[PDB]
Amino acid sequence: SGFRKMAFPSGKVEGCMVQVTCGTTTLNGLWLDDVVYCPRHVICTSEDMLNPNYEDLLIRKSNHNFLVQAGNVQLRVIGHSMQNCVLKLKVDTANPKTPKYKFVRIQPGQTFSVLACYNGSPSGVYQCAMRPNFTIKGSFLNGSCGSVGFNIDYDCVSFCYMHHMELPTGVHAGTDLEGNFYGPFVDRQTAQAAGTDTTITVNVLAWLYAAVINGDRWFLNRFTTTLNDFNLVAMKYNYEPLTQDHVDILGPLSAQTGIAVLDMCASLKELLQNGMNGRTILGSALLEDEFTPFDVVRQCSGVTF
Amino acid sequence: SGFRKMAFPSGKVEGCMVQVTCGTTTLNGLWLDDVVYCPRHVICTSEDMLNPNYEDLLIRKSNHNFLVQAGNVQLRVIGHSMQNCVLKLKVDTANPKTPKYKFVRIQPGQTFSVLACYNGSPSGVYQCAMRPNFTIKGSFLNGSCGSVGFNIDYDCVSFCYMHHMELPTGVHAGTDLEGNFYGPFVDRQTAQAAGTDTTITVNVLAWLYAAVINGDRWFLNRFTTTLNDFNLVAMKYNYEPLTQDHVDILGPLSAQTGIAVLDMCASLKELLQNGMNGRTILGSALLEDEFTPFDVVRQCSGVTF
Ligand SMILES: *[C@H](CO)C(=O)N(c1ccc(C(C)(C)C)cc1)[C@@H](C(=O)NCc1ccccc1)c1cccnc1
């Protein structure tokens, strides 16, 4: 029993973290096979930040201007390439610790674990969600750039996020591992609107199912609703619209608890309209939207890696 | 910026997790040097549970009755001993992945990371606190027994918790690595009172400082208070009494924010007496007590390992 914000075991990613330095700037890189991946703004200096011409800046760099350290081991850089907003440094040694891996571009509302790193050394691991507006609400200090987000499936690491920057609003922005930003963001020091966020409705419902499985059931009610009716309430409260695809992915949790999805929607509707009256659900006084339906079943089933 | 419930990177502990089998029962063990540590109730069968005679049960076992598997391959058990509530299986191979480590017994109110495992394989990592009543509010399914809690300091792992059981109330109990239970619990299937829990006051204050550091400040008020007067309110709201030692360990956070400890106490007093009125602090609608003062400084300073 119990329900925690649980991250993946970080060992397979820890063995991939290196330090990348280019002149003044140091940050983290990801060493997989014989390539190191890192944010391209490693080649900026403090006067480039407002609008760097990354092509012009990279042209002034040669292989030997990039220092890559894996623990105490020095990697020899034998090629460099820019792909979108990431730098790819070819090194002359394949990482002996390379896990089986893929690069994925996740969808808003999906979750992943973050291994926060400084100077190529891991400091902590935590779980978060890609917000509907393509920010993440992370914990990142100066120098955390190049930290990565990932999911693990048995033995295979799916890398989905590389950290690039903090916005003036204190939330975080980054790229997939092909260097394409999530959302509208660019890697320069300008004010950048993230735009309206919403609550991930399918995740809230998943977490209510997790609550019922753990015995927290006071919120269950005598009502039901329709998808159209519920979506009227969702929009009033800035929740994402629920689709039949969402209902389908909630099927296994509905089967385990015996609570039809539209009946759980009616419970959520009443919680939105009436609040929680100073009660809690799974230790929380707010509705939590950072657990996917897969997250709930994995934690309520014991899947290992 | 940002503040998350951050666990330690779990890589150094992942390489120590093995599967232990004694007849029917399988759980997790911790392989350090040439010894495997696991809960002694691995030697129980399903009729033993109400009050096992562990001495008698262990006498009917010999070295070859214990099967230790580290991923692929079996270890050879060459000795066995019971220490309090843990079994120590001497194996013929020192773990090549043994990190530098210590065994520590932690104090109520301290935090640690848990690596939840099943069948010797890591499934997830999360941070938690030893409650004042010596339970933990974990996430543990059947077979999680033997999962361990730990802290890391640079390269040294301090193991502080081994998971043993879930109480009928849904909370979790375990031992230090010398096999001494935290709290009054015994490893048998009986109803066991955990007794009254309290909120860890010094941790709540620490988290309020983390909030101010991250810009959340609506709760700072014009009042101050005394240690005596604050403890009056603390006792009404089932908070641990604040001592001068607690004031002292909050010193670094008080200095970094310019807010004297007793001033933060007056803010907490007003929060306890008036609630939050639909506001949030660091994304939470409850007062959080699972971050120690050291947890805050580490996450706000970027200490690596
Ligand atoms: C990364 C290593 O320098 C880093 O930590 N960092 C950062 C990111 C991007 C850039 C440019 C402008 C793309 C060159 C510079 C530095 C800081 C950071 O984001 N600074 C700029 C910033 C911060 C906040 C609001 C507006 C602008 C960083 C700090 C904390 C978390 N992530 C990144």
Ligand SMILES: *[C@H](CO)C(=O)N(c1ccc(C(C)(C)C)cc1)[C@@H](C(=O)NCc1ccccc1)c1cccnc1
């Ligand atoms: C450990 C592997 O069997 C396990 O998961 N587990 C458990 C723990 C202790 C015992 C005895 C009674 C000490 C032999 C048996 C089994 C279960 C568990 O705790 N079962 C007993 C129980 C009693 C009261 C309330 C709940 C459970 C376990 C399940 C979930 C989390 N931790 C442990």
